[PDB]
Structure formats: C-alpha cells, structure tokens
Assembly symmetry: C3
Homo-oligomer: 293 residues x 3
C-alpha cells in the first residue's frame, strides 16, 4: 500500500485490516503510532470541512506537522501543473500528500511522485477514506457485511461516495440497491434501482447523499425543485418510522436539511451521521499508518 | 465558565478575575497553563488580523494545536449550516471553537454544541475579548474604573466594541459618553451623546472607533466625506494637545489613518493602541484557561 | 545581519557564510539550531508555492511555530496598511516576519519594525533567498564562481530573480550574459545581451525565467505568442544537446512547460530545477539562524 487512490485497488483483506486498526485506535486497544519528524501537505483543490479537518486531526495526533497549501494563494496562478506542485512538495521534504482535486483520475498524472498519496476525492470518481469510514461504522454496528441490505438514495452518477461504497460493499457480500431521480441513474453500476417505499421496511442501512449541485449543468440546476425531490427521494418522518429497530441512517455530509433528509432526523436515535465524522479521524489514522509504516 | 459570548453574561467579579489572571500571565507572577493534547478550531467568517492571530498566539503558547478552517474553502459552499459546521468540529475531537460571524447573536443557534465557544465577534452585537483586553489596559494604566470619564467616538450603532465596552464600563462604575455622527447614534445605549470639544479637556480615556463601512448601506457610503468626518469626530493635533497629562488614547484597530485619528498620533506618548494588541494575547490566554479548565 | 531585504546589502563574505552554513545543515556536518519558543508570521501578499512552503519547512525544522496570515481574510480589507499589519504582528509576540509584497521596495515603509524581516520578494525588485539558494546550488556543483559563464534567459526587466542574481554573480566574479525579447531588456543591468545560439556551447550555467504575465501591461499580453517565444528564447532539444558535459540548467520555478523550457528537459540529467527547491529549505534555515542568532 504505497498510495490510497481507489477502492478498486483494495482487497477485502486490506479493508478489514484498515477497519480493525481504526476500531482498535478508537477503543484504546491499540496505541497510536508516533511519526514525529515527518511532514504532510493537504492539497484541497475542492472545498472540504470533514475530510480536510479530520485528516489534519489524524496527522497532528500521530505527531506529523503540516505544510500549509491554499490553492488560491499558491503558484498554481503562475501556471504550475498538479505534477509540478506535488514534485515540489516532495523536493522540499514532505513525506505524504493528501489531495482532493476536481479532475476524475487526477492521480494518473502523478506516477513519478515518490512519496505516498492519499486521495481525498477525485471529482465524481473515488472517495476511499469516506468508503472505509462508512464500512468501519457498519462493522462497529453489526460485526459483518454479508447479506446486509443497503439502500443508497440520491445523486448517484455524480457521487464519488456512491461509486466507492458500491464497489466495496458488493465485494464484502452486501446487497446494494439505489434510489435515484432518472437524471442521476449511473449505468456503470450494476445494482437494482428501486423506489424507497418498496424496500424501506426491509433495509438494514439507508445511506443518503447530498445533491452535487456544483457538479451539475445548467438544465439540471434551472429545473431543480427541492420540495418535489424531498417527496420522492428524501428521508421524511413516514419513511424513518418504517425502519427496522436495528437499521441505521448514514450520510457522508454535509447535509442539506429538508432536501435528502428531514432536519430533525439528522440526530435521531438511528442516525450515525455525526458518528461517521468521529470514525473518520480513526480510519484516517489507520490509512496514514499503512502509508508511512 | 462554559462559553464567552456577551459582556451581558459576565459579572464584574468575573471581569476582575480575567483581567488579574491576564496581568499575572503577562508579568510572569503566574506561570502559563499547559493544555498539550487539546485542539482548537478558529472559525473566522468575517475578516480579522488581531483577534485571529492573537487567539492563535495564545492557543500555541498554552500548547494547543489548531485545526485549519478557512470559510471560503470549507463545505459551507455545499450548503452546510453554522450549527452543522460546529457540531462536525466537535465530532472530530475539537475541544474549543473561536467564532467570528456576520450574524448578530449567531451563538443562539449553537445551544446543542457541547464544547466551549469564544465569541470573536457577532456582527454589530458583542466583542467580549476586545472589551476585556480594553478593561485590562485601563486597569494596568490606573488600577480602578469607578468615576473614570470615558469618551467613545465614531460609528456607535454599528460597533460590537462600543456595545460590549458601554455595558462593562457602566457596570464597573465608569462615566461613559459617546460622540457620533447623527446617522450612527445608538438609541439602545443610555449614555449622553456629546461634542468631543465640550469634554476632551476632562476625559481620562478617549476610545476611537473605525467606521464600519462594510456594515453600512448605499446611502451612507455614497455621502461619506473623510475630511469632514475628521474635522467633526476625529482625534487631531488640537484635540490631542487638550488631553490631561494622565489621559490615554485607545482604538480596537485596525486604524484608518487621517479619518478617526491623525496618522502621527497612533504611536504618540498617550496612545495605548499597540499596547492593547499585546494585552489581547494575555487576556485570550486567561479566557482559554477559564474555558478549558 | 538584522534583516535580509536585498543582495545589494550583502558582502561576498556574508554570501559564503550563508551558502556554507546551508550546505553543512544539508550534509549533516552542522546540527540544526533549536529556536523552540519563537514565533514567525509568513505574510504572502503575492502567490507562492516554493518560497512560502520551504520557509515553513525551514521554520518548523528549527522548532519555530507559525502564526497563520492569509491576506484575503486579514483586516487589510478594513484598510490596514502594511506597516500596521507588521507592527501588529510584532506587538502580539512574533520574532520574525517573512514578507512577499507586490510593491518594489515595500520594506522602506518598515523602518520602525523592531523584529527581523526576510524579503520573500518585493514586486520586480529583489528575491534574496532565491539568489542565495541559486548560488548555493552553483557552489555545490563547481566549488567556485570566478570566471563562470552564466546565461540568464527570458523576462529580465520584470524579474526580481534576474536582478538579485546579476548583482551577486557579478560581485563573486562570474561572467553574466542575458538573452531577452527586446521588450524585456533591462537597461539598469550592465551585462551583454546575446542570442542563446551564439553562447550556448560555451556557457557553464543556463538559468531560465518564467514570463511574468501577471506583471505585464495590456499591449504585451495581447501580442504574446508562446510558440514564437519558445523558438527564440526557450531551452529546446537542440540547445540542450549543445551544453558542455559539466553544464547545468536552473529555473527558480514554477515552470511553464513548452514555453521557456521543453517539458521533458525539466528532469533531464543536467537540470538542477528540483535540486534548487530542496536546497532552498537549507538556505532558508541558514537565513533564519543568521536573523534569530
Ligand atoms: O457527499 C458530498 O456531498 C460531499 C462529500 N463529502 C465529504 O467528503 C465531506 P467534506 O466535503 O466536508 O470533506 C464529498 O464527496 O466530498
Ligand atoms: O471595529 C473595528 O474596526 C474592527 C474590530 N476590531 C477587531 O477585533 C480587530 P481585527 O478585525 O483585526 O481582529 C471588530 O469589531 O472586529
Ligand atoms: O520566477 C518566477 O516566475 C516567480 C519566482 N519564483 C519563486 O520565488 C517561486 P514561488 O513563487 O513558488 O515561491 C518569484 O519571483 O517569486
């Protein structure tokens, strides 16, 4: 594990080792590693609160120091390529890069980078640390994946979260289903597309997605009606009350309250939305350990 | 104390204890506390040099580590509420939030946050750390507040500094007076409005304010004449030369040289403007201690 | 050395002492100094990747802590002058300022700053840490400067790098030559202006410059042709193949690949472009040591 770029690059063995290490860091069963003397740069070319702040928390707790990089004050405005930016940070003594970039598969331009890269998101491609922390949360809830009924609702084709989660849940033997507006069906993902109300009473995990407005074109954005989306594709009171006693609600965040989820359900008893954000720190510690060990 | 949001929330006893702790940190009479292992996020949704950099100096000197948050690169652009931002930073393991936000009373939306909040400014509402460092500076100058004659000149109704200082000085038994253009009189603050030249010879403390151009409407901004404002409401040579031997000049900064104050008076003998910024570090150390103990 | 503002302020003795200290830090011959307990602010009012990130790497490796300052979130929008910003950071307990600013000779407004200032670039004026790391790289390559043939190609009159390097190379007894489009000839620098192809076979060092598009006026930017610039002023395959066995290629970065340099030459055997970026960390450690000693 030289890099962490895509869930398609991980075996189920590597997924279990990362999840179990993260759980043992969190429980105190395993003491945190010490990487005092090592440096990390966080390169966020798209916006982030959780992924950037939780990577920073993980890095500082493992004794790394950060090199500040804000895109808009960098020599990117002078015409510097992503490769030159990464190779520059290597040359000045960085031991690790964490990169979120708007280009799908940006990491294919970074073959000649000799320090580990953690992909914090490539456009609508992969979000492996979101997927791993989602899997960690499910594993802590139930202790197993095989036969789990998972419904992923919302903007599927524009979601790096849906893509990473589909591949890894399927490989772990979960039953993945999608609910989507017709416009946002992803043909590349072979799982059934269903009505929420046909399956809500027999699902174990409902994963809600934010609508990726900033990834959409003009026609989609001009015809968007929030109230109509909520009625057809959102978790409301009636749908929440049909969840089995054991079932949980997940969302990679941020939430648009009243759109994909009724506001007062965000911190309802079956929600693990804020739990996911806590777990992300421990999972990112496990990723850092695997890359720098 | 659990939070520091408003001077209306503090007793004069709490004000004295904060001022005295800050002075003892500054003098070396009291050793700095050690909060190694704790994390703070600085959330500045309005611009800042002093409040943000001095909070950062105070945090680092007490052994805290910071989680970087720039508003414009955060998931706020994806539609995340202030509450969700704060609860997210709590969930990932922040022990303290320092928040400046343009909404008056923003902190009333943060009742369900379980970690301490220091208000670095809520629009035109409160600026409690400015008020406390102003009070610390006055206390170090004179050793008492009762019967002090304080003139606060400039944009009163748009000033969180004037509002916080009015409440706390009045509670400590100071005589508070205002000089304002008619447009910027604050009706909510019961203190006399006076002409500078009627009281300048008998004041102990002149506090100058910056004009809050960024908080004004079109009509105010289109009619503004800097030279006319300076003649009527500014500290010039003639007004400075009428100050008593013991009197001091204060300004929360930044200064607009030639508007509320003649340029060469910013670092004149009776100015405590740069002294206030030094004292701000020690007062913010005292606040952090109270919030994290 | 109280400040580092201009190469015109340094003796050749001071240049040798800085270069040799930087080389001994890099080789491990000399242990890094420990400035734990000291604070630095990095004030980048123009964009930077190397100069800002390498100063930060140098600062953290010497045990300094940074006070975050981003121009666009500072009280500069409230009308604060550069002097007031610097004097504020002094007052709050900063021990060192690193400043990049668009105004040529900005530092002449900072006479009343009482802490050391390192100039990370003043408009088209001076870039002393670039020049010193360029000199360090040449010194490690050859062990001497006297009689060295150095060709500096590109936008000369808009380059703080060309200005700093001209003065210091000439003082060390190197033979400095320029290649420039007619528009970008600098009259203030008395060195021959030559065609690349007339001297390429006899030069020891080719230093390429980026075109300073952001420092240009309308007429220059509207008539720019990248293709034509590359043919006349760029390092291509034919020019690279004419270099002496011992000759090196330098560039302060970032590179515009295909303009001043053919893409596949950036990491060719004779290139020291990424070596320069590594050396900059050690040179900036030596500068910080000299200023805080
Ligand atoms: O799912 C979303 O809507 C955004 C999604 N979520 C995150 O990773 C959280 P954040 O943007 O705060 O780091 C992402 O793909 O970036
Ligand atoms: O009143 C002013 O001029 C600004 C005033 N002062 C400050 O706190 C200083 P700064 O904006 O640099 O943190 C404020 O209310 O933010
Ligand atoms: O030569 C250039 O193009 C810019 C030149 N280069 C640098 O110093 C490197 P950076 O801008 O990444 O700090 C400068 O003058 O800043």
């Amino acid at each position: 594990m030289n890099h962490l770029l895509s869930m398609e690059h991980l075996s189920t063995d590597q997924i279990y080792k990362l999840i179990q290490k993260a759980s043992q860091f969190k429980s105190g069963e395993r003491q945190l590693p010490n990487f005092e003397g090592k440096y990390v740069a966080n390169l966020f070319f798209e916006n982030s609160t959780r992924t950037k702040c939780s990577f920073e928390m993980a890095e500082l707790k493992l004794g790394l120091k950060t090199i500040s990089f804000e895109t808009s004050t960098s020599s990117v405005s002078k015409g510097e390529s992503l490769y030159d930016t990464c190779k520059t940070l290597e040359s000045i003594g960085c031991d690790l890069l964490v990169i979120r970039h708007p280009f799908n598969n940006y990491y294919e331009k970074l073959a000649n980078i000799n320090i580990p890269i953690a992909n914090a998101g490539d456009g609508s491609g992969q979000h492996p640390t979101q997927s791993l922390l989602d899997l960690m949360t499910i594993y802590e809830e139930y202790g197993y994946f095989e036969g789990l009924n998972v419904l992923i609702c919302g903007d599927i084709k524009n979601s790096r979260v849906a893509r990473s989660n589909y591949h890894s849940l399927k490989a772990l033997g979960a039953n993945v289903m999608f609910n989507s507006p017709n416009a946002w069906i992803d043909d590349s993902l072979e799982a059934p597309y269903v009505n929420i109300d046909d399956v809500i009473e027999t699902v174990d995990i409902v994963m809600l997605l934010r609508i990726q407005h900033e990834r959409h074109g003009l026609a989609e954005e001009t015809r968007f009606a929030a109230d109509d989306y909520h009625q057809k594709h959102g978790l409301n009171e009636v749908r929440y009350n049909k969840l089995q006693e054991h079932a949980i609600v997940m969302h990679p965040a941020p939430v648009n309250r009243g759109v994909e989820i009724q506001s007062d359900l965000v911190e309802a008893s079956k929600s693990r939305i804020f739990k996911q954000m806590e777990n992300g720190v421990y999972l990112r510690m496990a990723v850092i350990d695997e890359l720098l060990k």
